[PDB]
Amino acid sequence: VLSEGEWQLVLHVWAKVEADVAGHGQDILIRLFKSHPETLEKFDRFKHLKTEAEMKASEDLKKHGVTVLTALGAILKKKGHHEAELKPLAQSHATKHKIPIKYLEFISEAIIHVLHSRHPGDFGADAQGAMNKALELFRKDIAAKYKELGYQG
Ligand code: HEM
């Protein structure tokens, strides 16, 4: 459970992300795909992309980055009270998209790295630890739904 002070650190940096949702979404998905190429293979929509320049030039990838970060921002702003938001996301990601929890760990690393690059003054160690806790809570709660449905592993 995050404290109020931890949530304030999380949402303070997230308010900075929302100034350029699309650029953050690009940087995060590209980092994910470069650092963990198995993740790109899960996207029929993107797996034709073979270089970082092609990824950066894809408007559709930019659009999807906004989709992803909008969903995450709505979860973070619930401060843990996010059951309604996680139900459909866990269902689609477990049963339709077939995304292991481990890949949610990978995107969480990518998010933290990009926030550190873009917002160092609002993403010191205290905020890094708080965002790591928020993303762990996200994964814990999604993992419980995966387990219900027979997909935790
Ligand atoms: C912060 C974590 C993530 C969030 C908030 C998120 C959010 C979303 C949302 C809102 C959608 C569209 C609605 C839906 O299908 O549920 C979507 C689609 C999808 N996501 Fe995620 N996602 C996350 C992580 C991942 C990861 C790590 C992968 C793959 C490694 C992945 C793969 C997919 C795929 C394949 C689709 C469908 C894309 C398409 O063909 O249109 N997601 N995601």
UniProtKB/Swiss-Prot annotation:
Q: Globin domain spans which residues?
A: 1-147
Q: Which reaction does it catalyse?
A: Fe(III)-heme b-[protein] + nitric oxide + H2O = Fe(II)-heme b-[protein] + nitrite + 2 H(+); H2O2 + AH2 = A + 2 H2O
Q: Sorted alphabetically, which InterPro entries does this protein's record hold? A: Globin (IPR000971), Globin-like_sf (IPR009050), Myoglobin (IPR002335)
- Ligand binding (O2): 64
Which UniProt key words apply to this protein?
A: Cytoplasm, Heme, Iron, Metal-binding, Muscle protein, Oxidoreductase, Oxygen transport, Phosphoprotein, Transport
> Which residues take part in binding heme b?
93
What EC numbers are recorded for this enzyme?
A: 1.7.-.-, 1.11.1.-
Q: What does this protein do?
A: Monomeric heme protein which primary function is to store oxygen and facilitate its diffusion within muscle tissues. Reversibly binds oxygen through a pentacoordinated heme iron and enables its timely and efficient release as needed during periods of heightened demand. Depending on the oxidative conditions of tissues and cells, and in addition to its ability to bind oxygen, it also has a nitrite reductase activity whereby it regulates the production of bioactive nitric oxide.
Note the effect listed for residue 121 to A. Answer: In metmyoglobin
User: Where located?
Assistant: Cytoplasm, Sarcoplasm
The name of this protein is: Myoglobin
One of the protein's GO biological processes: removal of superoxide radicals
Q: Which residues carry this modification: Phosphoserine?
A: 3
S-S pairs: none
Residue positions binding nitrite: 64
Q: Molecular function (GO) terms listed?
A: heme binding; metal ion binding; nitrite reductase activity; oxygen binding; oxygen carrier activity; peroxidase activity
Q: Would you name any one GO CC term? A: extracellular exosome
Q: What is its main location?
A: cytoplasm
Give a yes or no for keyword Nucleus in this entry. Answer: no
Family note: Belongs to the globin family.
On subunit structure and binding partners, the annotation says:
Monomeric.
Q: Which residues carry this modification: Phosphothreonine?
A: 67
